[PDB]
Design an enzyme around this catalytic site. Structure first.
Site, PDB file in Angstrom:
ATOM      1  N   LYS A 145      41.716  40.549  33.425  1.00  0.00           N
ATOM      2  CA  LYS A 145      41.148  41.838  33.034  1.00  0.00           C
ATOM      3  C   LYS A 145      41.486  42.133  31.571  1.00  0.00           C
ATOM      4  O   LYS A 145      41.954  43.224  31.198  1.00  0.00           O
ATOM      5  CB  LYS A 145      41.604  42.924  34.019  1.00  0.00           C
ATOM      6  CG  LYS A 145      40.854  42.743  35.358  1.00  0.00           C
ATOM      7  CD  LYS A 145      41.631  43.092  36.634  1.00  0.00           C
ATOM      8  CE  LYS A 145      40.721  42.933  37.843  1.00  0.00           C
ATOM      9  NZ  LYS A 145      41.352  42.827  39.228  1.00  0.00           N
TER      10      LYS A 145
HETATM   11  C1  LIG Z   1      40.753  43.199  40.313  1.00  0.00           C
HETATM   12  C2  LIG Z   1      39.760  44.180  40.237  1.00  0.00           C
HETATM   13  C3  LIG Z   1      39.500  44.965  41.368  1.00  0.00           C
HETATM   14  O1  LIG Z   1      38.607  45.834  41.356  1.00  0.00           O
HETATM   15  N1  LIG Z   1      40.197  44.791  42.519  1.00  0.00           N
HETATM   16  C4  LIG Z   1      41.148  43.822  42.567  1.00  0.00           C
HETATM   17  O2  LIG Z   1      41.792  43.674  43.637  1.00  0.00           O
HETATM   18  N2  LIG Z   1      41.421  43.067  41.483  1.00  0.00           N
HETATM   19  C5  LIG Z   1      42.314  41.917  41.657  1.00  0.00           C
HETATM   20  O3  LIG Z   1      41.610  41.168  42.702  1.00  0.00           O
HETATM   21  C6  LIG Z   1      42.496  40.562  43.646  1.00  0.00           C
HETATM   22  C7  LIG Z   1      42.437  41.118  45.073  1.00  0.00           C
HETATM   23  O4  LIG Z   1      43.180  40.239  45.921  1.00  0.00           O
HETATM   24  P1  LIG Z   1      43.562  40.581  47.458  1.00  0.00           P
HETATM   25  O5  LIG Z   1      42.540  39.849  48.291  1.00  0.00           O
HETATM   26  O6  LIG Z   1      44.936  39.987  47.619  1.00  0.00           O
HETATM   27  O7  LIG Z   1      43.542  42.080  47.610  1.00  0.00           O
HETATM   28  C8  LIG Z   1      43.852  40.698  42.968  1.00  0.00           C
HETATM   29  O8  LIG Z   1      43.935  39.551  42.086  1.00  0.00           O
HETATM   30  C9  LIG Z   1      43.724  42.007  42.194  1.00  0.00           C
HETATM   31  F1  LIG Z   1      44.501  41.981  41.080  1.00  0.00           F
END
Ligand SMILES: *c1cc(=O)[nH]c(=O)n1[C@@H]1O[C@H](COP(=O)(O)O)[C@@H](O)[C@H]1F
Ligand SMILES: *c1cc(=O)[nH]c(=O)n1[C@@H]1O[C@H](COP(=O)(O)O)[C@@H](O)[C@H]1F
Lengths: 330, 322
Positions: A145
């Protein structure tokens, strides 16, 4: 008519893999301290069954950092390499998840935040994870990000696309879209790269700026999506087999519908299924594209924190594919 | 255990400036330092080795303590590490007496892999020993569970006093950056409000909520979250990144949030106007208007003198404003 591994644009690499395995599962590899600690404990209890399987895999010999340490017997690590024990079990946890789950994965996404909190040691792990995925030829996303001014972000471009040899990354363009010229393009080398920009995120308060802020009755997330695609067109990405796509959360059903409706051929990355409780049927239906690679469904913790990650991955693969079939047989 | 608010105030009383020195060394800066040191018999490295503080860095100290002639022959794999770390120590040694704070941008420390992160750790160790207040500029953003990892890295591992944050995803992320409920710990951050990039207006100004531009909305929400977290009562704060080329916004922010903490990058390499920025952002407690200068110091061939002249000019401008 054949292109060799590593010698094509990401659009092409994704399409080929999607044709091969017929899914849009994106496996998230976000190991936390408890994960690593647990892996070490479990391997110690079972005479390192999984580490020994890792060590027979041919491409472990092709990672860049401290192979000398990675290839040691686990009991030698514990007894003779105490200061490398954490590096070793962290890296072997990652290889384990990859080995167990890769046959189901359209793409792996690694979130940088999980690899930095111990200092340099996790960055060595992350580099090895990327080298390993490159050797297996599994499409990659570095989730970071990122955002800064152009002169600063070119350092991230170098780290992500040259050092890690990642296929793509995530980007927050709130500062501006001009940063993308220094992330998705390298003017010195004339190379193009792919990214997913934040559009609608999964955090519970994501509406506070993404939906509350507007310009002439279009909400911020729509304006931001449009601006990103405008920059993609300017940079010629899709003509060079790269793209700028969108992160749209798996709990943002109306926004997923709007994005797929208004930008019919966009690439979407959707986190939020599993640990964050998003609705898979609704997400995949609203974001559906017949080129499945355009709707990546990211699942991290619900696979990596399962005791049997191969079976967890297969179960998500099958659930996704059943919904894909429902859409193909609409 | 001081709290960043207190650190800033006390250092301001000792050195009477709001100069924030940016330490963002690029590949060309490191290579130039190496080349120059070679040609001038390692004059600056030799000076570095005489400073007491070097004895307290965490990572590969014995390497850093070796003579350069020996590094290049018998520890060649550590050559880049050594020169990168010594460039940083040289800049800090030459300029620290003029700095209210140092700000290190993470992006410069990552593109070679782990090696730059060891440098970054040693830099924070070195500044901690010099008791100079610190900012890690990384403009972090993610969901709560993820950003906890940045809290650990920044505030436990580096032991930074503060960081920069992008709250476009949401403000709640701050609960997992500026606060550790388990340990009852509080930390400070500056959130992006108005940035220096040339197209910054596109979302920060052109988007609005009921005829207030996005940047005002975002600043207000950041302070709302600060209130919720009770930061300021714990000697910490959430403040604002406001570009030193954004005079209207700086003017508005200082007017509308009279006692806010502002970090302002954009002078020097990005052309911003020092007199106008310090004037529009002025506060009597001038630690509330950090003027960041990075490249105009680190890419100056005479960095002590460059830092001195920003210190002197800031001080003349501060007196004008009273
Ligand atoms: C980034 C952006 C967003 O909107 N949501 C989000 O969760 N993230 C990143 O995406 C994954 C989610 O992983 P999970 O399946 O363990 O919840 C993580 O890398 C978080 F940082
Ligand atoms: C961050 C936010 C912003 O609005 N502008 C900005 O330049 N940054 C970061 O701030 C400094 C500027 O340093 P300089 O004196 O060398 O221009 C950098 O760390 C940049 F990344």
């Amino acid at each position: 008519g054949l292109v060799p591994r590593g010698s094509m644009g990401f659009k092409v690499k994704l399409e080929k893999r999607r044709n091969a395995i017929n899914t849009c599962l994106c496996i998230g590899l976000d190991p936390d301290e408890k994960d690593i600690e647990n892996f070490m404990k479990n391997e110690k209890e079972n005479n390192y069954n999984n580490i020994k399987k890792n060590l027979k895999e041919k491409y472990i010999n092709n990672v860049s950092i401290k192979k000398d340490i990675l290839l040691k017997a686990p009991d030698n690590i514990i007894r003779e390499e105490k200061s490398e024990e954490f590096f070793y079990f962290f890296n072997h946890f990652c290889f384990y998840i990859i080995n167990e789950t890769n046959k189901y994965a359209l793409t792996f996404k690694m979130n940088f935040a999980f690899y930095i909190p111990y200092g340099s040691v996790g960055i060595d792990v992350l580099k090895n994870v990327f080298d390993y995925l490159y050797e297996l030829n599994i499409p990659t996303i570095l989730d970071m990000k990122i955002n800064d001014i152009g002169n600063t972000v070119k350092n991230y471009r170098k780290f992500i696309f040259e050092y890690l040899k990642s296929d793509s990354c995530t980007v927050n363009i709130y500062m501006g879209t001009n940063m993308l010229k220094d992330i998705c393009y390298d003017e010195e080398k004339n190379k193009y790269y792919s990214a997913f920009v934040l559009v609608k995120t999964t955090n519970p308060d994501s509406a506070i700026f993404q939906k509350n802020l507007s310009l002439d009755n279009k909400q911020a997330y729509v304006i931001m999506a449009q601006e990103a695609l405008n920059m993609s067109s300017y940079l010629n990405l899709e003509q060079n087999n790269e793209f700028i796509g969108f992160v749209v959360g798996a709990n943002s059903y109306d926004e997923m519908n709007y994005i797929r409706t208004y930008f019919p051929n966009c690439y979407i990355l959707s986190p939020g299924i599993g640990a964050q409780n998003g609705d898979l049927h609704k997400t995949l239906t609203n974001g559906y594209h017949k080129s499945y690679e355009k709707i990546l469904i990211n699942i991290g913790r619900a696979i990596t924190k399962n005791p049997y990650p191969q079976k967890a991955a297969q179960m998500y693969y099958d659930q996704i594919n059943a919904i894909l079939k429902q859409n193909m047989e609409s």
